[PDB]
């Protein structure tokens, strides 16, 4: 039989997407932009515009619902104590820093910098849309990105509240009232749960705190050095941006018509022979919009599954202790 | 070579334009581009015209579409009141026409018809950028939760002396309504030639 | 009129209009069109 | 309500002309000769086929969502009803 | 079996005419002129 005489406290990172960028597509401005006869002919296709709008609105509401179910799990915002002493464990790297304009931790400051968003959906004062961009063209062609309900500050406050509740109450803050408990006793309860006697912790608290600090430092160094750590969120953002770019590029297609511009067809041909080209253009653009909506629905289902998994992992590993193997990282959680 | 149509005066800064037959609608602004002598029209990524050279004067003018934006209406139930709020998403209050028909600037859009308050309550109607509206129609930053702080200490512990046996409900769908659609009776009802033409579309 | 309308022509502009003039037989007026084949098309005058 | 609205939209899409002279098949068959009535019936056929395909795609997505929800519900049944689950916030908030 | 049936249905859909005179591309290319063959090539391309 083999029995270990020592142990190494390791910290492993796990990136899981919770939501994606919203999108609102106006069918009229996209297909029959600044056109009257095209807009009149578009009404003969039915409620496809309404179906697309309902699908996009459902996706937008579902993203916020997933974000709320993942981050907003507690009803109270617990604050960290002023004395940042927890028996040797240094949480300054994960606790929020009041010196920054945004109340985010030094680790979150790196996470928000490694991921670059294409369009967050903020206010555009029409001053940067002209003169000396892909986002501007998407907006002019009807593709509009909507901002999320919970801002980054609210997500950071929820994360800080969850962290404070954890480090101050063990697992009792999730099941009910936040019962205060010393951290060298929360760690003892964790060790007793994983099958290790508490005297090991009460004798090697210093070594365990040193190992935890070194692991946090190595995690910060890996997040600062390795750019592919947050590759999943960047890939999701890039997929959304590429979908928007493809949808705005599909307008360049002719779909068997004489020209991809509606005004050119209206000025070169009479209505009796221009309607047959307007119909082809409308059909092609509507098929492109339907394909985009189907792809967005599939991506929204994938994001919903990922967000449900992330919320389950949150409720199991953060708000409590999970005995499931390889669920809360590799090793005894 | 063009047609017998006469030219009109040039106006800059939302009018309809016609440059050598190229019809459209947008604003014209002094461009800083470097059009070549043999280049007359410009084209962006979306295959639209973003700049055009005037036939009379050799100056280059950018073509930018006029201001627009989504119009989201914020309204409570009809059985409660009839007053509504308008949210011009993506458009600033200093910029806001096709529609025939108390002002606060949010990060999601200009909100007209709601009074902003400093007090925070639970989010009733999700508006965007952390702002939520509720019923007059008021606007407020949504509250994340009740304020609470744990009295952590080196030798302080909390142990409950009582307990409450509560019951919580949880609704989860298991199935939905079945549907069987006959393509023939739906597309070519009581028609024979229509069915013969539909049979050519394969096994869809 | 291919690509243009016979009536909506006085409101457009052109780069360089070339007027091709030739006389062919009456029954031979079938190949004056894009993608046509025949004697006059393959040997005398072909349109793109 | 989503299933009902999908059925209502699918039965309403028959009112669309899809570029044809009329949405009624009998009207097109009685007003035009077959050589020019086939090209008008083809537009309606294509439109209704695209509507049916969109409805089937939406129903498949909803069926996948319902399958995920039913798997979650069966897991919750087997864990909370037929036993006792130690997973936090799984069998309701609190010590299950 | 579902993957195989999907592949077989996708390869069988080429037999459809989609309103054209024939499902074979070469038949349409050799029987009609380009002025009236594109209207069938477009239908075939759209269906496929």
Swiss-Prot record, chain B:
Q: Which residues are glycosylated?
A: 79, 92, 118, 154, 162
Q: How is it modified after translation?
A: The cytoplasmic Cys-rich domain is palmitoylated. Palmitoylated spike proteins drive the formation of localized ordered cholesterol and sphingo-lipid-rich lipid nanodomains in the early Golgi, where viral budding occurs.
Q: List the disulfide bonds.
A: 14-66, 93-110, 123-132, 188-194
Q: Where is this region: Disordered?
A: 1-17
Biotech application, in the record's words, is: Main component of the anti-COVID vaccine Chadox1/AZD1222/AstraZeneca; in which the human tPA leader sequence is added in N-terminus to enhance protein secretion.
Q: Where is this protein localized, as stated in its record?
A: Virion membrane; Host endoplasmic reticulum-Golgi intermediate compartment membrane; Host cell membrane
Substitution effect: residue 46 to D: In strain: Alpha/B.1.1.7
Give the recorded effect for residue 161 to I: In strain: Alpha/B.1.1.7
State the family it belongs to. Answer: Belongs to the betacoronaviruses spike protein family.
Q: What does the comment on domains in this protein's record state? A: Contains sequence and structural motifs very similar to those of a bacterial superantigen and can directly bind and activate T-cell receptors. Activation of a broad T-cell repertoire may be involved in the hyperinflammatory syndrome in acute COVID disease.
Q: Report further notes.
A: Variant D614G has become the most prevalent circulating sequence in the global pandemic since April 2020. The mutation is associated with higher viral loads produced in cell culture and animal models. It would not change pathogenicity nor neutralization properties vs vaccination. May be prevalent because the mutation increases virus transmission in human population.
Identification of the protein by name: Spike glycoprotein
**Organism this protein belongs to:** Severe acute respiratory syndrome coronavirus 2
**Span within the entire protein?**
524 to 759 of 1273
From Swiss-Prot, chain D:
Q: Look up what happens after changing residue 30 to A.
A: In strain: Alpha/B.1.1.7
Coiled coil start-end: 1-41
Top-level taxonomic group: Viruses
Q: Name which cysteines form disulfide bonds.
A: 80-91
Described function: Subunit of the fusion protein that is processed upon entry into the host cell. Mediates fusion of the virion and cellular membranes by functioning as a class I viral fusion protein. Contains a viral fusion peptide that is unmasked after S2 cleavage. This cleavage can occur at the cell membrane by host TMPRSS2 or during endocytosis by host CSTL. In either case, this triggers an extensive and irreversible conformational change that leads to fusion of the viral envelope with the cellular cytoplasmic membrane, releasing viral genomic RNA into the host cell cytoplasm.
The molecule here is called Spike protein S2'
